[PDB]
């Protein structure tokens, strides 16, 4: 239920004389047996993890911490990557572009693995059978093949109902409309075909 494979990477524990193995998120070009070096004083090599001050801008990173020591919140799933866009010298921040095209500013102490997370493009295969859609879901959780609430009855959904055939009100519903009126297009700024040049400025 994670499309991206993980690496079991085993280290010395510098505190007790024992091997402690931790699960990192496997970047492409991470072959078993490559030495990975996790550090401030690290060479920029795939999959070394380095605090973001150390990597020159336009380096791509995976597994990036939003707060230093929060163990790598971002870019965990297949082919997503953040790019270091540069730095704000005052209050030691490295600014990144998130895989949403959203740009966010993060402290430079934040560690990130130089990488593009393996089995990407997981998306490319269309499917063909809904047996495989079932098989995907039964690993993950009970994400039901989505029964249309129109098809139902008005007790069951506010959208179902009908001699004829409707939602009957804009499926576009407020943020403030309070649960369970959030059947649909929850605060749609614009609805109807996205025309054009998508990518944030």
């Amino acid at each position: 239920g994670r499309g991206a494979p993980l690496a079991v990477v085993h280290f010395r524990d510098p505190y007790r004389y024992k091997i402690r193995k931790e699960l990192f998120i496997a970047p492409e070009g991470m072959h078993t047996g490559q030495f990975v070096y996790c550090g401030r004083k690290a060479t920029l090599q795939i999959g070394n993890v380095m605090p973001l001050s150390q990597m020159p801008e336009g380096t791509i990173i995976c597994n990036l911490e939003e707060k230093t020591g929060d163990r790598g919140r971002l870019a965990r799933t297949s082919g997503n990557y953040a790019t270091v866009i540069a730095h704000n010298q005052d209050t030691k921040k490295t600014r990144v572009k998130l895989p949403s095209g959203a740009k966010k500013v993060v402290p430079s102490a934040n560690r990130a693995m130089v990488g593009i997370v393996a089995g990407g493009g997981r998306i490319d295969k269309p499917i063909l059978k809904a047996g495989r859609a079932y098989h995907k879901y039964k690993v993950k959780r009970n994400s039901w093949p989505k029964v249309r609430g129109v098809a139902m009855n008005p007790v069951e959904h506010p959208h179902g109902g009908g001699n004829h055939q409707h939602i009957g009100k804009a499926s576009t519903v407020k943020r403030g409309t309070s649960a369970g009126r959030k059947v649909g297009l929850i605060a749609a700024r614009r609805t109807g075909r996205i025309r054009g040049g998508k990518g944030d400025s």
């Binding site: 690496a7 496997a26 492409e28 072959h31 078993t32 060479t43 020159p56 380096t59 791509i60 269309p126």
Partner: protein, 91 residues
Amino acid sequence: AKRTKKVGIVGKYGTRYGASLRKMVKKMEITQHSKYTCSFCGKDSMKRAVVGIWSCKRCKRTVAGGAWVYSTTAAASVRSAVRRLRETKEQ
């Protein structure tokens, strides 16, 4: 016999699931199951174990890769880019 000119591998899916979808399948199911050159053994003995993981039958060096392809198009560019920035920072 070249039994089927058009379908090749997508003849498993036969009549079901519309021709345009079946053309897309043909490329991907060729790239997966295909023996790739292992950079670490120089032998073409690398086959797809599972979705993102390619194990070389000999040397047993198991490499992380793209889901259908050992090297995804993004990756090649990715790896060259980081490498080039590495040179300028050092000297």
